Amino acid sequence: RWEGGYERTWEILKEDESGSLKATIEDILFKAKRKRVFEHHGQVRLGMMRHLYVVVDGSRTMEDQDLKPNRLTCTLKLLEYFVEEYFDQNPISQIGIIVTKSKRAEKLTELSGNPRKHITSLKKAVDMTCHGEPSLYNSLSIAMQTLKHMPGHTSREVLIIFSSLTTCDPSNIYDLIKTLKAAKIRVSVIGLSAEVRVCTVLARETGGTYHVILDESHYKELLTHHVSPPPASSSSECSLIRMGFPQHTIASLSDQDAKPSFSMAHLDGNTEPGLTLGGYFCPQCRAKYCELPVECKICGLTLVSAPHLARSYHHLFPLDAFQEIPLEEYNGERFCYGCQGELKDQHVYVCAVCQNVFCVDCDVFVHDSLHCCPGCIHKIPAPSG
Amino acid sequence: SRGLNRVHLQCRNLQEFLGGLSPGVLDRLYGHPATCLAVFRELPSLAKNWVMRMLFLEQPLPQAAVALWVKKEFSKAQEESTGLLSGLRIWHTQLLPGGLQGLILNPIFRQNLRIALLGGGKAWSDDTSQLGPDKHARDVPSLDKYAEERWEVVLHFMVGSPSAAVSQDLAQLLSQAGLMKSTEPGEPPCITSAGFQFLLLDTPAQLWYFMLQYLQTAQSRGMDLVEILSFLFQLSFSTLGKDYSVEGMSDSLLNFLQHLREFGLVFQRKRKSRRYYPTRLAINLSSGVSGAGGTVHQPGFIVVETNYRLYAYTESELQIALIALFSEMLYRFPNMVVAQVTRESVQQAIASGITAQQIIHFLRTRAHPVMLKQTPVLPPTITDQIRLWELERDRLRFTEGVLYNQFLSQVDFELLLAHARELGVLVFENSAKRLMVVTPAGHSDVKRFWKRQ
Amino acid sequence: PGNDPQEAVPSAAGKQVDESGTKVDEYGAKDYRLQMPLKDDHTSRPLWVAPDGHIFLEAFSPVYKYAQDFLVAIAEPVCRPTHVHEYKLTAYSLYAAVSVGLQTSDITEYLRKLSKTGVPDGIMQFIKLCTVSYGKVKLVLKHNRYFVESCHPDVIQHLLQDPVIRECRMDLFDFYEQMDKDEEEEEETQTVSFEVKQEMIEELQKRCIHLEYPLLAEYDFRNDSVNPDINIDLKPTAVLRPYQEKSLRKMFGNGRARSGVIVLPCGAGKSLVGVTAACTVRKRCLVLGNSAVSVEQWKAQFKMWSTIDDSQICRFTSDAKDKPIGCSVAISTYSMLGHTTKRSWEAERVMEWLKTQEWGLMILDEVHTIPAKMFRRVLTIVQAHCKLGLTATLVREDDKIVDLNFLIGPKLYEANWMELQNNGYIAKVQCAEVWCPMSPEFYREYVAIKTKKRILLYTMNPNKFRACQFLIKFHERRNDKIIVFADNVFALKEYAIRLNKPYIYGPTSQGERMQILQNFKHNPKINTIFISKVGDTSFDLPEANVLIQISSHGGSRRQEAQRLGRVLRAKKGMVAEEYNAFFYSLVSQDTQEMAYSTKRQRFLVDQGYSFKVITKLAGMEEEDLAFSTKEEQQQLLQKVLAATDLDAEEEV
Ligand SMILES: [Zn+2]
Ligand SMILES: [Zn+2]
Ligand SMILES: [Zn+2]
């Protein structure tokens, strides 16, 4: 019965085209198993200066293995990567690390952009018991009251790491729809390997996007989907003003070494508990402390540092696309317009405008690293006007 | 104890030789082919920039400017990069050009180097006989097999072939080398101790060393010539020549060439002539350093998981011979997976001494594309096993000496301490029992000193 | 006599196994393992079929081909070493009579289809179908119905031989009762089942059933219908884990009649699945404990995960005599007696309540412990119809003459270390054969004296103690359980004198030994304990996290390796994927201990675990080392000079 039936599963899958060329097409189906969802982007409108809120379910669902030795191990490790790749892409923003554990919510790291503080917090978050049940109501309470004091010229989005369990919290979180719909705060959850309808209704009543974790690769995809600053609901803001352009200071300008250290509890700046020698300078406090392209606590305006953060999204929107042809128009001497090679896996990648020939390793290098076709350069800037 | 300099010696090859001979004899080592030989068998990055000025520096720059080229960071590394470059005798310390010593290079090398930098259609560049591809009569991967099998008939006939070696007088030098030897009846081409070490080595630079020692056995030809010719081999391959090695001939240049097809690295046709052939072998001599190109054959991955030697790939018999010295006694079939012994392969280094890196080298040379997707730490603990195994049998450090006991005084013993420490002929002392371990070679100078007082 | 199924085949046809010349059937493989790997995949790789000995596993680019067959190809293999993503060797044995949902030619096809026509030597061929699949159902009419098979072409030899040896032959309250008898269908196809020859002839028959070329599979139809009584089973909230959930699923993938023998690793759910088989099966069962040591244990988790206890408890060794009158579910011990009135009425009860046991179940822990002389009394005394072999050992006692499927039938399941130690509750041991540089004033004497006081010399070593003193405080800092196993008492006694710890010996009072277990296994203040030869064997299963050993002299590799395999449990709830169970051994250099450890670490890498030899400490004088002066060691030395041979012998 089943001793045969356990091996009726194996026997055919083992078997293939016999005689010659055996265990060959089994490898071909594995390549045919590949090539999942690429981009499907092309959007406009919103996404600028997010104010994210990490919300972590700490529950007994973590004790199931399912991808890793812990579901936090699946979670927490790639959050650091998600932190770094965020600060890579979006430095104009800041993130609220808030942890739910034992039916409450602990705002673990404040809404800020200092990566080491966030990452070591995750390195502190390693040895978490995740005792108790999730409570989103305490999480939204922090999320309200913090972002309540943020301007309406702020992007208001929440990223919830939920372990798909029972949403164990009172006090009419169904009525928190109209609370937060009016409060123009977006809330995005993704479910860990299952679905919560109420939370699925929550996000579809939000405009925040809900998903379910499939796999570790798939876990990365939706992170990567939420790296990009999304086009949230209309009528948020237009502008955001008193973007402080700073100065770097060399502390060697006119008076050479007239100050042994530029942090002595009286100097304009010197914000954090450490010694400094003068590296930076804000306009409004005239605040000189450790360099930070974010904001301050006395002038209270945004320490904008343009080549970093006014450059990051500044080309992250205006992209175009390529096309693929299997044909052989042999442009070059059977070459690439970029790296100049050939393999011909029938993916001759042609630009939409300048129409230049590329490979996967030239398409990926654009569509992950270069983000534009340089074949448009020499082609845009020469007749540009 | 045991010799350990006969394995590597890869900067002293151009130093201990060169500094062991005269400046005018190494003035001969500034043939224009010998220019690339200088820069590469030394590997400092720090002296490798101190050269770079001198093509634009005819002038002797002052010593302090480059003595203070690099500040507080790595002053020793600057100093370690300095006197060795000076120990090449390529520099001249000027006296007082402007008021103080300002160093400068030998210009005749600067003459020779700049032709190998820009311009020059000279004798090595062109105009006399250098090189010549006329029409393809013979191909390189076919000759790569020659460049494999001559190594075999070298390395197998070291161990001993059921086949035979070609008619060489080289064995009478390799028996002379102390790699091989032969007792007088019939002259058996065995191994003494050192070919066994070279069996554990895999680079042609030892061959090169005995080929540098080839003229040393009372032969009087161009040592200047052959080391130029040692470079003149190091030209990759792809050249037959309209007998261009005879148009650029010399006496030893043709005769010792008969030996380079004995050494296999040249390939000579009918009458040992009409062409010449450098083999793809002509780039790993150039370093002696491991090299990703130095892969010979690409068998596969290995591992030594559960320290049980763990690999397959039915290879040629030379690798089988490379482990016939290294793994018998539970050999198996068609995959070459002789099991492990922590005693026998340990006993299989007793005729070599420690093969510490030579394990690690043949770790990355057993099956060659192993570093493609494997761990950086290829032996997890297994190096230390091999180490402790090597650190087991080495129970002795052989050292002769003369010892001075029952000395008549105690403070004059400290004089003879300070006397021998002046001489540097002491190895060890015991002051508590009035003892000094003194070299017996430097015994006589204290033996003379004690008899004088 | 009459105990001969097909023994393991390869004995000849091979000369200097370096078949650089012949490899003739491997040349058939080496054609297509080498002609096939050209374009970035191998489509080859015959598992390196070797005629004699065994063959291998590729398992380095398994992808789907051999990674599916990382398990499935291993049916008749056993995968005796384990590795990293590389090759993996095995052995070969009786394990086709277990693999009886498949034909020996069907595997032979896929044995070829894996090997890319890497052709057999034939050695396996002449050993493929030596025993055709054949079962022995025990159907409702009180003994057996003479089941043959799904397939017919076997009675054609059989019925032309066997009968000429020995013949064979209210409404709604009862409506569903025949609906159950409606479910008594064709036994998957045709059954071909005959009638019991009077219940006393099968013993006379079984010896001739195998006599041609067939082999028989005794079953246990004890679940749907059963004419005698059923005890009260009750599984009181005994949540268990998928290592052993798969196990009974292998015992029951078919209907309600098939016996079973399953291998676990050490310390696994041993007293669970049999207790699970005690209750789910609805039988009246039997345990055969190894000693009374086992007997107290196996009832205790039975007292835990079964509420079947209302003097419903039958433990039967060393004057236990607990519930003779009325047997429901029993624990016994292997009556190895054969003596002249050994236990007069007591073993008579063991005889006569075996008869009341009828068949029950043969719960058999670790039958590598059982000799073949006792394997006589396995079948001779106990004549049951379903067995249970709880034996971690696959191959034992170097006896390739008598195999074990003739004893217990098929050997059903073995559980992977990898899917317990990396994915599962079983902790990761760091094995440590630690050798030390001794003081030479133990060794000049040693080589002077060719008399067993020399054994005690390296034994009583402060260089051993400096290691012993070390890891105590080094693992006091992690606040986790540690246990040290010495060789003999009076050396170990001074360890319990110098750095005095919990400890035992041979004649120690058990009620205070139990207090020591209470002081150890409950009290968190002292995580340190000493044991002797007896405590591993005759009193306790210790439950700890870190083990140190001193004794390594006798060649019982596994017997020592199953001590550590039982004791070492999970250290903490560690988030990391590291090794958390810990083994330590103390090795004398230049010694029998140096020599034995070489074979011992050979046996360690024979099964293959996380192993490291360290020699130096993590800073020796970091700790205030006692015996730092060798004069103090000379004080110990003169005790050793005053010592006799009596401190230098174990329990045997
Ligand atoms: Zn300000
Ligand atoms: Zn391209
Ligand atoms: Zn373009």
Tab-separated table of N, CA and C and ligand atoms in Angstrom, chain A residues 336-340 357-363, ligand 2:
chain	number	residue	atom	x	y	z
A	336	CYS	N	28.380	43.890	-26.853
A	336	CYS	CA	27.477	44.656	-26.017
A	336	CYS	C	27.861	46.127	-26.056
A	337	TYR	N	26.843	46.982	-26.000
A	337	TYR	CA	27.070	48.417	-25.927
A	337	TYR	C	27.707	48.815	-24.609
A	338	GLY	N	27.497	48.012	-23.573
A	338	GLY	CA	28.116	48.211	-22.286
A	338	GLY	C	29.367	47.371	-22.175
A	339	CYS	N	29.282	46.239	-21.467
A	339	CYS	CA	30.450	45.452	-21.080
A	339	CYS	C	31.223	44.867	-22.257
A	340	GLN	N	30.628	44.837	-23.458
A	340	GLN	CA	31.214	44.352	-24.709
A	340	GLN	C	31.589	42.874	-24.627
A	357	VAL	N	22.468	47.862	-27.262
A	357	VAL	CA	22.400	46.420	-27.033
A	357	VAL	C	23.067	46.067	-25.713
A	358	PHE	N	22.339	45.369	-24.846
A	358	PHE	CA	22.928	45.026	-23.561
A	358	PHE	C	22.700	43.576	-23.177
A	359	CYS	N	23.361	43.144	-22.110
A	359	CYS	CA	23.217	41.793	-21.605
A	359	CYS	C	22.452	41.866	-20.297
A	360	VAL	N	22.209	40.693	-19.705
A	360	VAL	CA	21.671	40.612	-18.352
A	360	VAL	C	22.578	41.341	-17.379
A	361	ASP	N	23.879	41.072	-17.454
A	361	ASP	CA	24.821	41.721	-16.556
A	361	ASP	C	24.995	43.194	-16.883
A	362	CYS	N	24.518	43.640	-18.044
A	362	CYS	CA	24.364	45.068	-18.261
A	362	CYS	C	22.959	45.553	-17.929
A	363	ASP	N	21.948	44.692	-18.037
A	363	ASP	CA	20.609	45.115	-17.643
A	363	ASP	C	20.463	45.194	-16.133
D	2	ZN	ZN	25.366	43.928	-21.654
